[PDB]
């Protein structure tokens, strides 16, 4: 058996030897050096651009401007307003204005300096409030007030629900913008073949299909002339879930130069690409009954979204979509505003749009619980979904729910009953719940295709090749797909060779975003494996003169149930299956049923709709040094309901990575702008946690067994991130008695709260 | 201007004409073609370019190639014996101290330096030695486990 | 390839040859390059040549002298200093400060000379060529205006080196060599409180060694504050040395770093002869505040940086007192 | 063609097909004379 | 060197009514391509 | 004539790039002669 | 022993430390990584390694790398302008002067030398210039046609 076995990732050997080739490692001796000229202004009109002197420099092969990129792009079909190279105006400092391809780095740098751009500088807006003022310039003509999207929804009778409450409290929380800091720098290698008018790209993307679509659209080139390959990828965490400007620019330069262009990006430029979690202000209002039952919820979320639309519409809907599906809440009112600002566009980052409002809800729920004299773990148990299946007011369908077990498990593992409220001054414990979808059940592009497709090939040699368009970004999708297919087939994992993410070879996949891969590609892989197993059982039965129903496949042996016959080896069955057939190729697909795609009557409900949710409960132990105000997270105990852990080893690592990223946002990470200038553009002043202050993290796996997931599986990588923020928020309150209203809980913020406490 | 650079790299004698201003990182990746050593930042902040110079860790992006003349330099490509993984490499693979794999060559070289100097490190000594190596995937937990596992394996060998 | 100017790299075998190499225009000393190379890569400097000091025989030795003093060559690594048994036992503040610098891999090569002579820092300075040129550069390099203190009478970049204050309270001496020969000064005198001309080394001069005297009745410690627990420069750092006579302060030396354009001694004579109590600690905080000039050259705020600088000065002295 | 590809993807996704060819038995020589398979073929290229 | 990748592309494109440029040929890699008996006795154009 | 043989001892797999007109026959004989399962062998013919 | 070798290769300045006994063929293929230049024999019999040195053909397998110091060396990789074929390359492709492609780089370099020296060669002059280049696939007929086509196309422009 392969499912449920702790399994090192199938591509780990190449990672530990340095043999794995990431985009910037790919050899291409004829490659030119690509460089982008970025706007030094946060907001400005482009009056003129003269590239004549740059083009005349020996060694410069091509220079491009926005005059050559008349088609904009955006990850959402309804909001494509970013041009590969700027047209008419720039909207953030770093916005691409021109690009060059040269024989070497020093020549490319000189060329950028020779390009003359005449700008008409405009006032820039750093905050949602400044951008929404009546006299502000509209960044985009179709949104005069700079509000990209507003959400105003009410589920149930909210006024009557609050009237039924015994206690009502409201508080505002603010959350700094954060960045993914995947360790690999952005890069694209673009090979344009002018003889055939074809383009091949190797790029740092989690969404090769989206890259294929946007490169074809933006270069006005038929999709059949483009091939997209994702080589090994050094993470992404959401950053690379939209086609990015540098990928399209590399393609544009390669075509202009009629050759190959390698466009590498610096770490500063990777921070400029951004697409991270937006600065968000959340007003949270909760009404409770005296016994702790939730009576009502009303929240407001305002996001500073940066300069272009991107994922914005989706992100702002997520601020309210996952207020549902965790606790039973009688009525919910949600109002939200996504506002353009003259800063790098925000986007999707692990937990996409649900982290900040989840943190705010958990923190106020705990605070109100204290006021009612109810333990923070108990107030969550009191409010769990009353029965399963459960359909939320947002039309989500919860078919598996491991929250009760997650809570009991972390309560026991952390010694919560024993220790909560009995720690030394300066130390504390906190608990929180969080959850996330196992893939958005509705694709972004309506094409009527299956939601995942996997192909298997088996020939005379007996090796099975599994072809998938899915992007393994370090999470292990190539191992996952192999495990589930091998389990169905009764073969060893070593018999499966995975070819992935190369558009000329592998079936299209929608991308590694919203934790959809295990659920969808896992089910498609099972589907393909069942098709192949059917073909082999048919051949074995014939060779064994038995009926197909009586054939059992045990560890690469096809036996006749009950019989004594030794049966046939897998290789003997392959040989039999080749007769009158030759090479076997099968296809498996998976499509989320319509009942899991929301309710058309609730506008935008597809966002937040999914086949199932991963749930996590976590307890965090932390201490606070009152002299410096420094908060130290010592340990986290986290129980995650992943439906069925296909690879427990990877589930543990994914959960530790998710909790840890939340710890970075909770304690030290934050971007900083000064009149449009990025101040945090390096990994010294953007404080990704080091191993020294990072907590130990103990993971407990809960298996609720989802009825529709592959072998019962749900996602295992995003549902645990958000809970860390409110859990450590509570630990800090127990340690030193202050209640933070702004993340990160860095020493500067803690010392201000301590000084105010003492002043009062 | 180029000058002669002599050193031992991954067990082999090298004698190359190298620009005086060339960083060790660029010499390894571009002159020799050893792409295991990575670049994760714009200078000295991430540890992804960590290599060994006379058994001690060194940041290849913040070292001039000419500064290692006459020394023993080792990159991740040197650890395996032909295709067989070293115990440290096997531990990172088996314990999942590596996910995306990008910080792994630097993390493993820093770990190799630690184990050559302190064969049986405490958890705190492991954290102290890897303090400048950033990883965004793992939350570090299993990286510590990989180093402990490797230390034990090397000791009973 | 990462862009650098096309400089020559000299690798002298003796201090005399290093000094002669430094006579040329646009020529800079080079230690392990952990501070200098990241700055040159960002375009902060356009040298014609670098003079590598790491190949100089004998420049990295740590030894004890007749009197029981410590002598450290400018080339000794921070790792060797932090791990040296004699230093940890007799001059723990220096081992503490050396170990607090950057990360362990930087310390494996970073030199004492380079740590003392590291460049000052400011968020308008430690930025790329694209970033700075887009902002019109600044008074410290290629511009004419200071963006932190608009008056622009000087550069106010902050000195964040950890080792300097520890050596200053330990009353260390600096041995300097140059075209005029050898000279020695109290380590505190190696610094000038000016962001863009922060060292008192002249053209062609190099820090060759540091000598620390026997401690006598002095105890000393160094405390650093940073948000992460490794790699970060000090947001504020304070070293102190104490002589205690019964229940009174017989001697006291306090040095701060991460607060001004130079690491500085705080005049604390007012505390001598008195007790170490709450009133004395508040007096000390006010003296540290007066010497400090916390400005927004950092991404972290001035309010916090100043508050913790005062808080840890009291904590480090209280630690020495209670021991 | 591209409009038809889009239509064909509906309810299908990636299309994979297989084609095969096998020489009919009459072109494999005399089934009872094993050596006659050498020289048997579907057809001959002739040259003058 | 005889042109079997071109030959296979030509005949498939003719049947489909498409340009030769629309066909990308992947050949002779056992992990990806169907087994072929070999380029011997001039069998490839006729059989493949 | 030339052969590049990559043997992966961690997985006990062999990948060959070789100067052959008959990659299927090579696959069969390498498996038989090395007494190695054919499923552990990959044969690729690059340009020839 | 190694010594400094400076030359211009495919339009770029090279300054490398190269063994005194290194053949130009091995320097191109292994030191620089330009695999277009081929080895078809054990020494001077086939022309597959033909490259240009100061516009004239030279057998890279029978020339020491150090003998081309200070000269202009060109291999097949230098003829195209980025990805755009030269007229000579386009003619070999379009007229089928190349089948398996193995003798092609040497055949094209010998042809390039000929056309630089004699822009409108007769059939006899084409055969005379290619006399030492062996091809086993074509019977030479279409190679001659390729050179004639390229010559006429270069005379246009
Ligand atoms: C991410 C990061 C974090 C860091 N954190 C810290 C920290 O926490 N604390 C800290 O103090 N430093 C820190 N640094 C700075 C630097 O790494 C250390 O100060 C270090 O000790 C530099 O020594 P070095 O030998 O590498 O010097 P180099 O970088 O070689 O030289 C630095 C400067 O000193 C000059 N110089 C070198 N040797 C001499 C000499 N003998 N005489 C005269 N001039 C000389 C050079 O010309 C140059 O201007 C950090 C650097 C980075 C990149
Ligand atoms: N039940 C179960 C589940 C799962 N698993 C596992 O785990 C993993 C994961 O899974 P999921 O959860 O399903 O996911 P996917 O979809 O595959 O993926 C994606 C994700 O992934 C994660 N993770 C990770 N890791 C790494 N390493 N890197 C990364 O980058 C990342 N990113 C992150 C994110 S953020 Mo977005 O994008 O914001 O939307 S989304 C995301 C897989 O593979 C495997 O290994 C198992 O085993 N079991
Ligand atoms: N009708 C017709 C036919 C054909 N074609 C063409 O021609 C070719 C060929 O074909 P064929 O004849 O069919 O053949 P194949 O099978 O494919 O192949 C194989 C062969 O091939 C030939 N040729 C050649 N070429 C080159 N260039 N190289 C070679 O090597 C060679 N080899 C030779 C031989 S010798 Mo044996 O092996 O003895 O058995 S066999 C052989 C093809 O591809 C195409 O291009 C056409 O067009 N049409
Ligand atoms: S303090 Fe002023 S002059 Fe000095 S680096 Fe900063 S901005 Fe420039
Ligand atoms: S690449 Fe980041 S420290 Fe060297
Ligand atoms: S394994 Fe991905 S950055 Fe460490
Ligand atoms: S390889 Fe045959 S002549 Fe050179
Ligand atoms: S084309 Fe094959 S040897 Fe000439
Ligand atoms: Cl969020
Ligand atoms: K307006
Ligand atoms: Na030009």
Strand partners, B58: B51
Q: Which domain holds residue C197?
A: 1-216
Interface size between A and D, measured as CB pairs under 8 A: 33
Q: Do residue A343 and residue A310 come from a single domain? A: yes
Instruction: Among A78, A108, A123, give the residue marking a domain's end.
Output: A123
Domain closes at, from C177, C192, C216: C216
- Tokens, residue G50: 């033909």
Q: Roughly how many angstroms between the first and final C-alpha of chain A, as a whole number?
A: 64
C189 shares a domain with C267: no
Helix (H) or strand (E) holding F16: strand F13-18
Q: Is G40 exposed, middle or buried (0-12, 13-18, 19+ CB in 10 A)?
A: middle
Q: Are strands C49-52 and C27-30 parallel, antiparallel or unpaired?
A: parallel
End position of a domain, from candidates C195, C216, C237: C216
Token digits for G3? 């010594």
Q: Is residue A455 within 8 Å of A496, Cβ to Cβ? A: no
Structure-token match 């970004």, residue found: A473
In this complex, do G101 and E1 lie within 8 Å of one another by their Cβ atoms?
A: yes
Helices and strands: H and E segment counts in chain B:
5, 5
Candidates C10, C21, C108, C299, partner chain B, best to mutate (most B CBs within 10 A): C108
* Separation of alpha carbons A256 and A239, rounded Å: 28
Whether A200 and A328 share a structural domain = no
Please give the number of the atom of ligand 7 that sits closest to the Cα of G47.
Answer: 3
What is the C-alpha separation between A672 and A683, in angstroms, rounded? Answer: 13
Tell whether A449 and A546 lie within a shared domain.
Answer: yes
Q: Which domain holds residue A518?
A: 439-611
Q: How far is the CA of E1 from the centre of ligand 8 (A)?
A: 8
Give the whole-angstrom CA distance, residue C292 versus residue C262: 10
What span, in angstroms and rounded, lies between the C-alpha atoms of A295 and A329?
7
Instruction: Tell whether A525 and A630 lie within a shared domain.
Output: no
CB-CB under 8 Å, A459 with E35: yes
CA distances from C285 to A139, A629, C240, C271, C299 (A): 49, 18, 13, 11, 24
Longest pairwise C-alpha distance within chain G: 49
**Same-domain pairing of C179 and C117:** yes
Closest CA to G120 of G145, G147, G96, G93: G147
What are the contacts of G47-50 at 24+ separation with CB within 8 A?
G47/G103, G47/G106, G47/G107, G47/G110, G47/G130, G47/G132, G47/G133, G47/G134, G48/G102, G48/G103, G48/G105, G48/G106, G48/G133, G48/G134, G49/G25, G49/G106, G50/G105, G50/G106, G50/G107, G50/G109, G50/G110, G50/G133
CA distance G62 to G26: 11
d(CA A410, CA A430): 11
Please tell me what DSSP assigns to residue E41: T
Q: If you measure from the C-alpha of residue C299 to the centroid of ligand 1, how many angstroms do you get, rounded to a whole number? A: 20
- Paired tokens of E7: 């030959």
Residue found under tokens 């019989």: A563
Contact E38 F21 (CB under 8 A): yes
CATH number at residue A104: 3.90.1170.50
Query: Does the CB of B45 have a partner CB in chain C at under 8 Å?
Result: yes
The number of helices, as runs of H, and strands, as runs of E, in chain C is 11, 12
For residue E26, the distance in angstroms to the closest alpha carbon of chain A comes to 9
Residue A511 CA, chain-centre distance (Å), reads 10
Q: Among candidates C97, C126, C34, C117, which has minimal Cα distance to C237? A: C97
What distance in Å separates the CA atoms of residue C112 and residue C210, rounded to the nearest whole number? 9
Which pair of structure tokens corresponds to residue A427? 């130390």
CB A56 within 8 A of CB A120: no
Verify that A140 and A281 share a domain, yes or no: yes
Task: Give the three-class secondary structure for A635.
Answer: strand
Q: What is the resolution of this structure in A?
A: 1.6
- Can you read off the two tokens belonging to residue A326? 């965790």
Within 10 Å of residue C68's Cβ, how many Cβ atoms? 12
Pair E35, A578: CB distance under 8 Å: no
Contact A666, A745 (CB under 8 A): yes
Q: Is the backbone peptide bond immediately before D16 cis, with ω within 30 degrees of 0?
A: no
Structure tokens at A542: 């014939």
Report how far apart, in Å, the C-alpha atoms of A431 and of each of A453, A750, B141, B143, E4 are. Answer: 40, 20, 21, 26, 66
Nearest to C34 by CA among B127, B132, B19: B132
- In CATH, which of 3.10.20.30, 1.10.287.3510, 3.40.50.1360, 3.30.470.20 is domain B1-78? 3.10.20.30
Of C30, C34, C105, the CB nearest to B47: C105
A496 and A433 in a single domain? The answer is no
Indicate which of D4, D14, D17, D25 best probes the interface with A, i.e. most A CBs within 10 Å of its own CB. D14
Whether B145 contacts B97, CB under 8 Å? yes
Task: Tell which residue, C165, C175, C149, has the closest CA to residue C316.
Answer: C165
Q: What is the SS3 assignment for A222? A: coil
Mutate which of A628, A631, A749 to test chain C, going by most C C-beta atoms within 10 A?
Answer: A628
Which atom of ligand 7 is least distant from the CA of G50? 4
Q: Are B136 and A690 in contact (CB under 8 A)?
A: no
Give the per-residue SS3 of chain G.
CEEEEEEEECCEEEEEEEECCCEHHHHHHHHHCCCCCCCCCCCCCCCCCEEEECCEEEEHHHCEHHHHCCCEEECHHHCCECCECCHHHHHHHHCCCCCCCCCHHHHHHHHHHHHHHCCCCCHHHHHHHCCCCCCCCCCCHHHHHHHHHHHHHHHCC
- Strand runs labelled E in B63-121: 72-74
Ligand 4 near C139 CB (within 6 A): yes
Q: At C272, list the tokens.
A: 């001598």
In a domain, A4, yes or no: no
Could B56 and C108 be called an inter-chain contact, meaning their C-beta atoms sit closer than 8 Å? Answer: yes
Q: Count of CB atoms within 10 A of residue G122's CB?
A: 10
Query: Chain G: residue nearest E6 by CA?
Result: G99
Residue C225 forms beta bridges with which residues? C236
Q: How far apart are CA G6 and CA G18, in angstroms?
A: 10
Tell me the chain F residues in contact with residue E47 when contact means C-beta distances shorter than 8 Å.
Answer: none
* Residue C196, φ and ψ in degrees, nearest 5: -100, 0
Distance CA A433, CA A436 (A): 11
The H or E element containing residue A537 is helix A522-544
- Please tell me if residue F4 touches chain E, with a CB cutoff of 8 Å: no
Question: Residue A750: CB partners within 8 Å, gap ≥ 6?
Answer: A624, A629, A630, A631, A732, A736, A738, A740
Contact partners, residue B153, CB within 8 Å, separation at least 6: B87, B90, B91
Q: Taking phi first (over 0 means left), then psi (-120 to 50 degrees means alpha), and beta for anything else, what does residue A391 get?
A: beta
Nearest to C320 by CA among C229, C252, C235: C252
* Residues 18-47, chain E, touching A (beta carbon < 8 A): 21-22, 24, 26, 30-32, 34-35
* CATH class of the domain comprising G79-157: mainly alpha
The three-class DSSP label of residue A431 is strand
**Which two tokens mark F42?**
């990959």
SS (H, E, C) C58-102: CCCCEEECCCCCEEEECCCEHHHHHHCHHHHHHCHHHHHHHHHCC
Instruction: Judge whether G77 and G34 are in contact, CB under 8 Å.
Output: yes
Indicate yes or no: CB of F21 within 8 angstroms of CB of E37: no
Q: Whose CA is nearest to atom 2 of ligand 6?
A: B100
Q: CA dihedral defined by A731, A735, A737, A741, rounded to 10 degrees?
A: -40
**Cis, bond preceding A138 (omega within 30 deg of 0):** no
Q: How many CB atoms lie within 10 A of CB A679?
A: 17
Q: What chain E residue is nearest to A465 in terms of C-alpha separation?
A: E31
Of G33, G77, G83, the CB nearest to A258: G83
DSSP string, C33-54: -TTHHHHHHTT----SEEEE-T
Q: In testing the pocket of ligand 4, which one of C137, C142, C145, C147 has its CB within 8 Å of the most ligand atoms?
A: C147
Question: In degrees rounded to 5, what are phi and psi of residue C49?
Answer: -160, 150
- Omega before G149 within 30 of 0, i.e. cis: no
Q: How many angstroms separate the CA atoms of A485 and A470, rounded?
A: 15
The DSSP bridge pattern shows strands A742-743 and A167-175 to be parallel
**C-alpha distance from residue A370 to each of A291, A380, A416, B10 (Å):** 12, 12, 16, 61
Does residue A2 lie within any of the structural domains? no
Q: Is the dihedral of CA B135, B141, B142, B144 positive or negative?
A: positive
E strand or H helix that includes residue B152: helix B141-155
Round the CA-based radius of gyration of chain A to a whole number and report it: 27
The tokens 């793992």 sit on which residue? B138
Query: CA C180, CA A402: separation in Å to the nearest integer?
Result: 78
Does A50 lie in the same domain as A106?
A: yes
Distance between Cα B45 and ligand 5 center (Å): 6
| Separation of alpha carbons C157 and C140, rounded Å | 8
Q: Domain limits of chain B? A: 1-78, 79-157
Q: Tell me the C-alpha distance between B65 and B29, whole Å.
A: 12
DSSP type of residue A584: E
Query: Residue whose CA is closest, atom 1 of ligand 7?
Result: G39
Residue B94 near chain A (CB below 8 Å): yes
Residues A495, A644, single domain; the answer is no
Distance A147 CA to ligand 10 centre (A): 10
Contact C123 A751 (CB under 8 A): no
Q: Which two tokens stand for residue A14?
A: 């190449």
Task: Give the tokens for residue A690.
Answer: 């080091």
Query: Which of A202, A335, A214, A307 lies closest to A261 in space, CA to CA?
Result: A202
Integer Cα distance of C298 and A409 in angstroms: 44
Q: How many structural domains comprise chain C?
A: 2
**Residues 6 or more apart from A507 whose CB is under 8 A from it?**
A453, A454, A455, A467, A468, A469, A587, D13, D14
Single out the residue of A605, A606, A633, A608 nearest to residue A621, CA to CA.
Answer: A633
- Domain of A173, CATH number, reads 3.30.365.10
Cβ proximity of A481 and A507 under 8 Å: no
Please tell me the number of Cα atoms within 13 Å of C84 on its side-chain side.
26
Contacts G101 to E, Cβ<8 Å: 1
Chains that touch A (3 or more CB pairs under 8 A): B, C, D, E, F, G
User: What are the residues whose beta carbons fall under 8 Å from the beta carbon of G33, sequence distance 6 or more?
Assistant: A29
Both tokens of A640, joined, read: 């995650």
Establish whether C117 is an annotated binding residue. Answer: no
> Which residues lie below 8 Å from residue F44, measured CB to CB, with a gap of 6+?
E28, E29, E30, F15, F16, F17, F18, F23
Question: What's the number of CA atoms in the CB half-sphere (13 Å) around residue B6?
Answer: 2
How many Å lie between the alpha carbon of C66 and the closest alpha carbon of chain A?
Answer: 40
Cα–Cα distance list, F27 to A495, F32, F41, F47 (Å): 16, 9, 7, 18
d(Cα A116, Cα C137) in Å, to the nearest integer? 19
Q: Given the structure tokens 């629900």, which residue do they identify?
A: A161
Which residue has a Cα nearest atom 4 of ligand 6? B135
Contacts of A494 in chain F (CB under 8 A): 11
Q: What are phi and psi of C126, to 5 degrees?
A: -85, 70
Contact A74, A309 (CB under 8 A): yes
CB contacts, 8 Å: A585 with chain D: 16, 18
DSSP tag of B81:
B
In order of B66, B67, C15, C106, the CA distances from C11 in angstroms are: 9, 8, 11, 21
Element (H, E) at A65: strand A60-65
Q: Are residues C68 and C171 in the same domain?
A: yes
Give the CA radius of gyration of chain D. Answer: 21
- CA distances, A137 to each of A130, A144, A146, G155 (Å): 10, 8, 8, 60
Angle (CA) G104 G105 G108, round 5°: 80
Q: Based on the domain organization, do A366 and A328 belong to the same domain?
A: no
* Residue A522: both structure tokens together: 């896992």
Measured CA to CA, the distance from residue A532 to residue A489 in angstroms comes to 8
Tokens encoding A601? 């009557």
Using the atom order of ligand 8, give the atom closest to the CA of residue G101: 1
Is A3 domain-assigned? no
SS3 labels along A687-732? CCCCCCCCCEEEEEEECCCCCCCHHHCCCCCCCCCCCHHHHHHHHH
Token pair of D27, please?
């072109």
Q: Give Cα separations from A340 to A85, A92, A312, A346 (angstroms).
A: 19, 11, 9, 10
10 Å CB burial of residue F23 (0-12, 13-18, 19+) is: buried
CA distance C274 to C283: 11
Q: What is the DSSP string of D1-48?
A: -HHHHHHHHTTT-S----------GGGS--TT-GGGGTT--S------
Check whether residue A157 and residue A293 sit in a common domain: yes
Strand-strand pairing, A613-624 and A584-590: unpaired
Q: Indicate the SS3 state at residue A370.
A: helix
The values of phi and psi at residue C307, to 5°, are -60, -45
Residues of B at the annotated binding site? 41, 46, 49, 61, 100, 103, 135, 137
Query: Judging by DSSP bridges, how do beta strands A677-678 and C70-73 pair with one another?
Result: unpaired
Q: Ligand 3 centroid vs E45 CA: distance in angstroms? A: 8
What tokens does A17 get? 């030897």
Of C216, C242, C277, the residue at which a domain comes to its end is: C216
Give helix A724-736 / helix A648-667 axis angle, nearest 10°: 50
DSSP lists the bridge partners of residue A444 as none
- Looking at chain E, the number of H-run helices and the number of E-run strands are 2, 0
* G101–E3 C-beta distance less than 8 A: no
Which residues 432-461 of A are in CB contact (within 8 Å) with D?
447-450, 453, 455
Give the C-alpha separation, C103 to C283, whole Å.
35
Atom 3, ligand 5: which residue's CA is nearest?
A: B44
3-state secondary structure of C180: coil
- Consult the annotation and say whether A237 binds a ligand: yes
Centre of ligand 4 to C-alpha A350, Å, is 37
Query: What is the DSSP pairing of strand A116-121 with strand A187-193?
Result: unpaired
What single-letter DSSP state applies at residue C262?
Answer: S
CB A536 within 8 A of CB A576: no
Number of domains in chain A: 5
Residue A731 CA to residue A729 CA, distance in Å, equals 6
Residue A5: count of CB within 10 angstroms of its CB: 14
A264 contacts A140 by C-beta, under 8 angstroms: no
Q: Is residue A157 part of a domain?
A: yes
Buried b (16+ CB within 10 A) or exposed e, A551-572: bebeebbbbbeeeeeebbebeb
């Amino acid at each position: 058996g392969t499912v449920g076995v702790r399994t090192p990732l199938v591509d780990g050997v190449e990672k530990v030897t340095g043999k794995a080739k990431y985009t910037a490692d790919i050899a291409a001796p004829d490659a030119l050096v690509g460089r982008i000229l970025r706007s030094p202004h946060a907001h400005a009109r482009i009056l003129a651009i003269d590239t004549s002197a740059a083009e005349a420099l020996e060694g410069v092969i091509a220079v491009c401007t926005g005059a050559e990129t008349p088609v904009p792009f955006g990850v959402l079909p309804i909001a494509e307003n970013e041009y590969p190279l700027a047209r008419d105006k720039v909207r953030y400092r770093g916005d691409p204005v021109a690009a060059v391809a040269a024989i070497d780095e020093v020549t490319a740098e000189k060329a950028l300096a020779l390009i003359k751009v005449d700008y008409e500088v405009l006032p820039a807006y750093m905050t949602p409030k400044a951008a929404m003022k009546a006299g502000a310039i509209a960044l985009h003509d179709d949104k005069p007030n700079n509000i990209l999207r507003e959400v105003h929804a009410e589920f149930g009778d909210v006024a009557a629900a609050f009237a039924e409450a015994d206690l009502i409290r409201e508080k505002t929380y603010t959350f700094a913008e954060v960045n993914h800091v995947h360790m690999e720098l952005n890069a694209t290698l673009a090979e344009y073949d002018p003889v055939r008018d074809m383009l091949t790209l190797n790029t740092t993307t989690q969404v090769p299909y989206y890259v294929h679509l946007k490169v074809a659209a933006c270069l006005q080139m038929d999709s059949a002339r483009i091939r997209v390959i994702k080589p090994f990828l050094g993470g992404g965490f959401g950053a690379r879930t939209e086609a990015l400007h540098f990928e399209i620019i590399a393609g544009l330069l390669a075509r202009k130069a009629k050759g190959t262009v390698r466009l590498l990006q610096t770490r500063e430029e990777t921070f400029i690409a951004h697409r991270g979690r937006p600065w968000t202000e959340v007003k949270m209002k909760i009404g409770l009954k005296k016994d702790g039952k939730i009576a009502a919820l009303a929240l407001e979320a305002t996001q500073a979204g940066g300069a272009y639309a991107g994922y914005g519409i989706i992100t702002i809907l997520y601020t309210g979509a996952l207020m549902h599906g965790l606790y039973h809440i009688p009525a919910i009112k949600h109002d939200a505003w996504r506002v353009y600002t003259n800063t790098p566009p925000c986007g999707a980052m692990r937990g996409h749009g649900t982290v900040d409002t989840r943190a705010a809800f958990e923190a106020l729920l705990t605070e109100m619980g204290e006021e009612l004299g109810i333990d923070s773990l108990k107030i969550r148990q009191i409010n769990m979904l009353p029965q399963i299946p459960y359909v939320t007011m947002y039309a989500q369908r919860v078919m598996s729910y491991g929250v009760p077990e997650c809570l009991e498990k972390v309560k026991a593992a952390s010694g919560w009953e024993e220790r909560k409220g009995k720690l030394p001054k300066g130390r504390g414990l906190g608990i929180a719940l969080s959850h996330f979808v196992s893939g958005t059940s509705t694709p972004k592009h309506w094409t009527g295709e299956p939601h995942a497709t996997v192909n298997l090939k088996l020939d005379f040699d007996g090796g099975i090749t599994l072809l998938t368009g899915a992007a393994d970004i370090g999470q292990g999708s190539n191992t996952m797909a192999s495990q589930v297919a091998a389990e169905v087939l009764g073969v060893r994992l070593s018999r499966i060779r995975v070819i992935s993410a190369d558009s000329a070879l592998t079936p299209k996949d929608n991308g590694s975003y919203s934790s959809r891969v295990t659920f969808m590609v896992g089910n498609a892989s099972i589907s393909a494996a069942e098709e192949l197993k059917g073909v082999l059982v048919k051949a074995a039965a014939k060779k064994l003169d038995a009926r197909e129903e009586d054939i059992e496949v045990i560890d690469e042996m096809f036996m006749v149930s009950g019989s004594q016959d030794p049966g046939l080896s897998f290789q003997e069955v392959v040989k039999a299956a080749m007769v009158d057939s030759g090479t076997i190729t099968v296809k498996g697909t998976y499509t989320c049923p319509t009942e899991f795609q929301g309710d058309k009557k609730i506008r935008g409900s597809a966002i937040g709709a999914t086949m199932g949710f991963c749930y996590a409960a976590q307890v965090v132990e932390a201490s606070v040094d009152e002299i410096t105000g420094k908060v130290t997270a010592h340990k986290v105990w986290v129980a995650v309901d992943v439906g069925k852990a296909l690879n427990p080893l990877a589930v543990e690592g994914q959960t530790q990575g998710g909790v840890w990223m939340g710890m970075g946002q909770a304690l030290s990470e934050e971007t900083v702008y000064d009149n449009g200038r990025m101040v945090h553009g390096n990994i010294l002043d953007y404080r990704v946690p080091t191993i020294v202050e990072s907590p130990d993290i103990e993971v407990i796996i809960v298996e609720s067994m989802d009825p529709n997931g592959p072998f019962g599986a749900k996602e295992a990588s995003e549902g645990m991130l958000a809970g860390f923020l409110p859990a450590i928020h509570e630990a800090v309150y127990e340690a030193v008695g202050v209640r933070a209203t702004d993340f990160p809980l860095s020493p500067d913020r803690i010392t201000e709260l301590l000084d105010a406490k003492e002043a009062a | 201007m180029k000058n002669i650079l002599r050193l031992t790299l991954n067990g082999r004698a090298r004698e190359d004409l190298v620009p005086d201003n060339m960083l060790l990182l660029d010499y390894l990746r571009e002159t020799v073609g050893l792409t295991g050593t990575k670049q994760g930042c714009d200078g000295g902040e991430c540890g992804a370019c960590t290599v060994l110079v006379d058994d001690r860790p060194r940041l290849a992006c913040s070292t001039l190639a000419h500064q290692v003349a006459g020394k023993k330099v080792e990159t991740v490509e040197s650890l395996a014996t032909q295709g067989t993984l070293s115990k440290l490499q096997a531990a990172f693979h088996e314990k999942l101290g590596t996910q995306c794999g990008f910080c792994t060559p630097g993390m493993i070289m820093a770990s190799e330096a630690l184990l050559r100097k302190n064969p049986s490190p405490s958890r705190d000594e492991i954290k102290a030695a890897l303090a400048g190596n950033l990883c965004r995937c793992t939350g570090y937990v299993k990286i510590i486990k990989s180093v402990e596992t490797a230390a034990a394996a090397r000791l009973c060998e | 390839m990462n862009i650098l100017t096309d400089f020559r790299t000299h690798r002298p075998a003796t201090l005399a040859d290093a000094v002669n190499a430094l006579a040329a225009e646009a020529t800079l000393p080079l230690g392990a390059g952990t501070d200098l190379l990241p700055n040159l890569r960002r375009g902060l400097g356009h040298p014609a040549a670098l003079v590598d000091l790491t190949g100089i025989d004998g420049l990295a030795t740590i030894s004890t002298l007749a009197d029981g003093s410590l002598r450290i060559g400018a080339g000794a690594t921070l790792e060797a200093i932090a791990e040296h048994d004699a230093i940890r036992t007799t001059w723990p503040a220096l081992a503490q400060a050396a170990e607090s610098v950057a990360g362990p891999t930087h310390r494996a090569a970073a030199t004492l000379g380079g740590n003392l002579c590291q460049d000052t820092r400011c968020t308008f300075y430690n930025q790329s060529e694209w970033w700075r040129s887009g902002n019109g550069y600044c008074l410290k390099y290629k511009g004419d205006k200071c963006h932190v203190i608009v008056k622009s009478d000087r550069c106010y970049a902050t000195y964040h080196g950890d080792v300097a204050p520890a050596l200053m309270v330990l009353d260390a001496r600096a041995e300097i060599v140059g075209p005029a020969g050898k000279r020695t000064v109290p380590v505190a005198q190696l610094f000038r409180e000016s962001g863009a001309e922060h060292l008192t080394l002249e053209k062609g001069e190099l820090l060759a060694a540091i000598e620390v005297p026997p401690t006598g009745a002095w105890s000393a410690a160094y405390s650093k504050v940073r948000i992460r627990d490794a790699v970060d420069f000090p947001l504020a750092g304070v070293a102190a040395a104490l002589q205690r006579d019964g229940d009174r302060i017989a001697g006291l030396r306090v040095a701060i770093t991460g607060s001004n354009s130079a690491p500085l001694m705080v005049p604390v004579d007012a505390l001598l002869g008195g007790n170490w109590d709450d009133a004395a600690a508040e007096t000390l905080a006010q003296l540290v505040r007066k010497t400090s000039n916390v400005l927004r050259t950092t991404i972290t705020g001035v309010k916090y940086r100043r508050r913790v600088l005062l808080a840890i000065s009291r904590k480090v002295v209280d630690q020495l007192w209670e021991a």
